[model samples]
Target: SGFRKMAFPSGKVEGCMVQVTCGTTTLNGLWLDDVVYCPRHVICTSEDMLNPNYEDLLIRKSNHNFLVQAGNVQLRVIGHSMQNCVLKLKVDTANPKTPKYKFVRIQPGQTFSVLACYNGSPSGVYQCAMRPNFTIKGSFLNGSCGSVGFNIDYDCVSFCYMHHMELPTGVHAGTDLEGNFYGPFVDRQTAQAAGTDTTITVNVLAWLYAAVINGDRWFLNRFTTTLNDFNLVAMKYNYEPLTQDHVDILGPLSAQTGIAVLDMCASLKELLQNGMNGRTILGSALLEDEFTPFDVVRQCSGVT
Candidate 1:
């Protein structure tokens, strides 16, 4: 049954031709001023017939979208209009508002890392960990915004692969059947004999190590340039910055001798294996690319 407005005529009501429109043909039920209600199969509002029977109606008053009781004669403001409006009445416990974060655009499909914590939570302290979902989206680097606001910090970086031509001489360069490049010693003979890809070989790493210890800037420049060309860059935390403990762990990696390099890598391997000591690795690309701590040691050897 439809609702009869309080001001509706008491005379016999005839056909279904009487329409109650809210902007357009809204609730197929009935309307009273700005409030609309329905009984049988109502629209945005409804009620039942019994001793405990009750009904609710949509009150479309000035800038308000309210749900009022049928027994309650007064209309009250419940919800307000938002700029980006959707034309549907959804059942939500919380009011829908635009996302709170300020967003900035980035290259399509680029990866990003973000750190966030909720307010007043017991374990709200930030930690260094990878929640892969955010990094999979290029646009995730947008400001500190979510359903519930968070204290957020972030870093963005790219991944890269070693190119066939980048390998040192004496090491053969080859590709797989799909014309995709693979490794330094890709020849079937070398691969079968050594049983390894040996792309960033220890010898080449040692050479890079030597160059670093010798204060050769040219090699460093070339190395970084090539890595950039491959789009394989490392992670850097500037927004939130790294902790002192992180610096301490990384400091020795920069200042080590050739004999101690392997030892350092071993220690780093153990430490990293133990979960990065509850901290994030700034040059974590090395880990993601399966680049050994030795490779990282060599990479950092040239930098001050």
Candidate 2:
């Protein structure tokens, strides 16, 4: 009323850009938070567009480093153990280097709040907690940026190969995808075609399979520990360990192919040419209770 306020956006917001048309003029090079200077004002009624994944990607962190809901900042502090600390919430998007930063202090145990609104976080299961520091005390059940693990079954994978695969007979063994390999249920003719001379192909290590499928090689390091855990679980039952399997498999690939993309290819060749029965030491007197984590892995991944 006393002074002229900047006109707001009126144009339809589409895709990622919320169009800014103020009055008879169109404003450019501004953000959602940008204030426009105009001759006069207009409702520029909404043309309200919302990003569906916006909130999912953004976070509203509180004083004690609690990541809460996004937009408008209704998150309030209930209590604290540290001395007066800054009440802040951060966000960023499109522009990585540029981030939304805030600084304000609140009493240790007093419930404090603010209109404080902005969207530093842009994805992942990042967490926050207590600190003389802010935003992080530590991490749990996750890693920085990205990571995950998979379990291959002892029934499916062995020192020889996985189901739908065969053991390596030689360095140049061909890999095949036929059959579920504890001797595939093939037609008698097709089985006989196998001939008395078997040229079984070799299978790959599970980690190497994951690397080529995902184009993530660091996962070799990422999953070494997981594979270690898997073997212990395997031993708990009667399954062959993943550790010994990889040592026999990748260790050879490292020797011959020198461990590169070709390893992914020739490795498949080896997966289909070997024998069926691999390390089944259990006597016929066994129960289903012998199932191990590797068995769980097998039952899941081996099915179709």
Candidate 3:
């Protein structure tokens, strides 16, 4: 929906006495009823028109019943005799949603305050239309000088892959059968070297190292240590045990700096596959509760 305002000169007078007629029109096919006309004079004095007060004048034509509500209101004056000509007219067809402040008109370099009076729900596309009054020469008829349009509602999602993982508990623990007192063989020389009063370190370190390497799986069966305490024990053993599980959990570094798990697993898998030898020990039950270290010396190495 929209509003239109047009101004015409009666051509009855000279020296700016030219009659000016102003009125409002609707483009949305909605009619306004009980229209009222209010004219605010600026350049022309009140004495210039018969009915200077907007409230004193009421516009009602046979074809159109509504009066000019709010836009530009003009006057028509001829020679020294200026009779109150029906210059200002208003019309309300039947639209209740139209804005009261529909149109605006101003003189050259003249400013006016706009008070929005229509309080009902807005109807049609609200807009403001302005043009030079009849006093200005060389201006085209119905020439739209400026306009602005307004409206109601206007809608807009944002996704990433991760790289690192953290272990819930930060520790590992285990035992070492070979280093413990119940092992199949003990070094008598080492035992002797430790005088009668020598104190034997129980080697809880081995258990801790196993815990760090195995991660959560390290205690799947009869393992008695929690990962946290196990890590502490391993630190005491003086064996720089690598917490592969911890590193693996963190993943591989995707960027030169960012961490990713797949890369870490691949690295560990490659090291074990290439370095360790697969051999079977006869009648030697694998110490399920202990941590063992092995040295891989290939046949090509002088150790054969």
Candidate 4:
């Protein structure tokens, strides 16, 4: 009597898939049948086993019967072992179809490797699979082993509340009117002409300082010197003798700076609403101190 062999079509198989299966008994390791392939081949290997049902059957891929196109094929597999397991390789050769399988048993703690090479043509996607054989009856044995998923194209982005102020580079310390780290001046010439800008700036800094200490109350108190007073003086310099040139510069600067101040106020209000946990604002004073100091002087002086 002649032996009958299972036959599959070579042209129908479009791609190749590899898989591994563990037996009821513990696996020693794994090995490959043939490490090489023909030209024009592309191999697609699956990383993990899909839909595993615990049984004595060893899961593996089917092997190819004929040589593939040169430089167009590839192969891959996936799994991890706590004890020992075996990997099986298979090949199929129908265009746009799945591959066939043939597996080799590997010794315990042994690594199994596979490769595909083609001359110049590009083949279809190659599917690879892994079968993890173990003694336990579940997907994984507790305290025995685990699996992690990774991809070549995984990406992500994250966002959160800013905890501190970030200053630009080249900012010099204590260089007040030159737009240095110490301060970015609005009307430094007038302040310097009267020798009051420095004092007014100091008061602004002081309100910020007090707000850090007393929280919101720092602004409620009626202080003799305040940001509004400084602004009043700045406005005088801006609109005084009301020149078209003065209006041209002051109008835009005033509008832009006013918008900036409004944004800063909104940010400060948000920080207060969130309740401070010893957090600081603008890297200078505590969150509560920021707006309150200005508020205190505004209320006491009848300045808008």
Candidate 5:
């Protein structure tokens, strides 16, 4: 049954059909001025039965897309019309017109973080707000704009391998493929005889424990360049502005994506260990012939 108008008085009427010139329509069930109310299924928006302006149809009206995280708060404000409008961002029961905030602009889907107490009773509703006649997306690093950064740490495997390559000529530490550390053998054949399964012996200091050795700017350049390349890769994979925290290359394709009001991912790690079984199988049809971190070291080392 459809809803009768607000002007409709209390009385259940008999069902009937009204035939008109052009078309014959049946309209009988608890008929409002404009809406029909079904006893079995009624819409929540039955209030505006007779009014042409469907504005009053809603049972409740309040701020939308509102949420608060531990240290951050954000929301999307909806503009109901093309008429210029403002948002009254206020706490419980504050008047939207003369509320606790002001603004220069407001739009649906616009996002920003805020700080406030989260304590409120069940019915304490906010009007969706802001203030100080202001804005934030000024420009990059010029005015009061935010800055960008890059982050790095020891590429331990690379460092370890490079450490042995820099040892003094005759020195040998524990063998690369064997267990016990042994001796200053005069020849490779003699060393091979001592440990049959031994590969290249570590003839060098442990990278971090190098007692006395100068640095290699060549290696430093390679590490820095590796950082920059992965930094660009992250921004592309993230599809956003680059940041220090996102220089990650091995993970996080779209794990925590957001529009401030929403955070989502397509299928977290299906392409990783779960779907690909811990190893990324290389393919010609999909992948470009991209270089690895080792390429940078080789290139930089060859430069000087």
Candidate 6:
């Protein structure tokens, strides 16, 4: 019952109409107050100004019916379009008169984060953790338009240094003959076979690492057997089980010298310190974590 009639936009084009449907009623004017929660209908020219400055474009029955005119009117869409839509820039405003297009695919529980890394005088990784200070006046939320994962506003701050930590590579862990176990192996198939039928890969190990240390319930639930196998051997000799989820990443050299010791805490600190750096899991136990480690120096180095 709470409704008010608003006037039509004065900057209207000859063949264009700006209509907003609120439930069963078609409002004649734009509700600028309801931008985040409402759908917008605007008719304008080509897609030329679609840079970082633009986002979603709502097309009603395709561009043929929606895009009615061409000119320098600053018309834009507000909410994330629910129906058929694509992201584009304001049309025909570019110096070169070229169309620009971008697309954003939405899924559930998608967290949005921004990072700005620069290396001019000194190298540092800056993360836009607090969204308030870095305001981009746009809407990305689950509303009448669609499910926008997360939207960030301006007035943000960021300044952080990273000392890139090298992740463990070429590592193996499994059981041996007589149901005994020898692990943190250097070679997949050793010169002497310890009856290691199943040699888990590094990526799987990383997944297991994320599962144990990161409290990744999904991975733990999906690969109970794999952890069980790792634990069966790890616990028999009083070594920490995967349940402990402690650090013990060994390098190839350390595996050879029999002084294989590395802590996951250091790696964890490095990864979490820089918001730009976060771990992700691909389908089927693929651990997708990253920080650039130089191959020539063979170490990940972040600004001190």
Each prediction's whole-model lDDT (CA)? 0.24, 0.22, 0.21, 0.23, 0.18, 0.23
The local distance difference test score of model 2 is 0.22
Q: Is candidate 2 or candidate 4 better by TM-score?
A: 2
**What tens digits encode model 1's per-residue C-alpha lDDT throughout 7-116?**
11111111101122232222221122232222111122212212211123223333233332222232343333211111122222222222222222222112122222
The TM-score measured for candidate 5 stands at: 0.16
* Candidate 4 segments exceeding 4 Å error: 1-51, 54-71, 74-304
Superposed by TM-score, candidate 3 places the C-alpha of residue 11 at a distance from the truth, in angstroms, of: 31
Write the residue-wise lDDT of candidate 6 on 1-304 in tens digits.
1111111111211111223333232212111122211123222122321221123333333322322112233334422333212222222223222112112322211113222111101111111111111111122221112111112222211111111101132222211111112222221122332232221222223333433432343322211234455455434433223432222332432243332122332232223233222334332322232210111012211111
Q: Of the pair 3 and 5, which is ahead by lDDT?
A: 3
The digit string of per-residue lDDT tens for model 4 on 1-304 reads 1111111122211122222222221111111133221100011112222223212222232233222231234333232211112122232322243223332332111111111111211122111111111011112221111111011111211110000111222111111111121123111111211111111222233233334333333222222332344345435433112123322422332243332232333333343345345644334444221122223333233342
Better of 5 and 6 by TM-score: 6
Give stretches of model 1 more than 4 Å off. Answer: 1-79, 82-146, 149-229, 232-304
> Would you give me the overall lDDT of model 4?
0.23
Q: What lDDT does candidate 2 reach at residue 292?
A: 26
lDDT for predicted candidate 5 compared with the true structure = 0.18
The sequence of per-residue lDDT tens digits that candidate 5 reaches over residues 1-304 is: 1110011111111110011010111111111122111111011123322232323322233334222111122222331111111112222321122212111222111112211111110111111111111111111110100011001122111000000000132222211111111233221122222222111001000110111112211111111223344335434443222233322321221222211101101121122113433322221111111122122222223322
Say which prediction, candidate 4 or candidate 6, comes out ahead on lDDT: 6
